[PDB]
């Protein structure tokens, strides 16, 4: 059973990566199950909707009263040392909000870190149907 724990903003980095203070330490988090267009992609550099995704995450996270992180049931860090979590700003999941606005796709999913996969696939179907952003 998943639970939310509190965290504090340090810096938004990209559409899908944020640095937070978590249990008293700075830590980089990568949003579970979504891929945003990148502004510092290792190879392509700046992709279309990169700046828009990155601004959406930044505004949502900077204007929140309360930020919480929710780990999934599997590994809690990736190979780069980033925390793998669902991030909530005032109780709304940022991972879902990005997919809903057509600013992210649902990622390739690695069981058992797939608890909210179906929920996110439903939001992406809606964004596609509305032809938002990525999908226009």
Curated annotation (Swiss-Prot):
Active-site residues per Swiss-Prot or TrEMBL entry:
30, 38, 82
Query: Where is this gene product found?
Result: Secreted
Q: Which residues bind Ca(2+)?
A: 16, 35-36
Ranges of Basic and acidic residues composition bias in the record: 116-132
Q: Where is this region: Disordered?
A: 116-136
What is the name of this protein?
Nuclease A
**Which organism is this protein's natural source?**
Staphylococcus aureus
- Shown segment, full-protein numbering: 88 to 223 of 231
């Amino acid at each position: 059973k998943l639970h939310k724990e509190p965290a504090t903003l340090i810096k938004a980095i990209d559409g899908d990566t944020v640095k937070l203070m978590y249990k008293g330490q700075p830590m980089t988090f990568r949003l579970l199950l979504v891929d945003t267009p990148e502004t510092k992609h290792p190879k392509k550099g700046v992709e279309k909707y990169g700046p828009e995704a990155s601004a959406f995450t930044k505004k949502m996270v900077e204007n929140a009263k309360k930020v919480e992180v929710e780990f999934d049931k599997g590994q809690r860090t990736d190979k780069y040392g980033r925390g793998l979590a669902y991030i909530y700003a005032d109780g709304k999941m940022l991972n879902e909000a990005l997919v809903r606005q057509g600013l992210a796709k649902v990622a390739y999913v690695y069981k058992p870190n797939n608890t909210h996969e179906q929920h996110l696939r439903k939001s992406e179907a809606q964004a596609k149907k509305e032809k938002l952003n990525i999908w226009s």
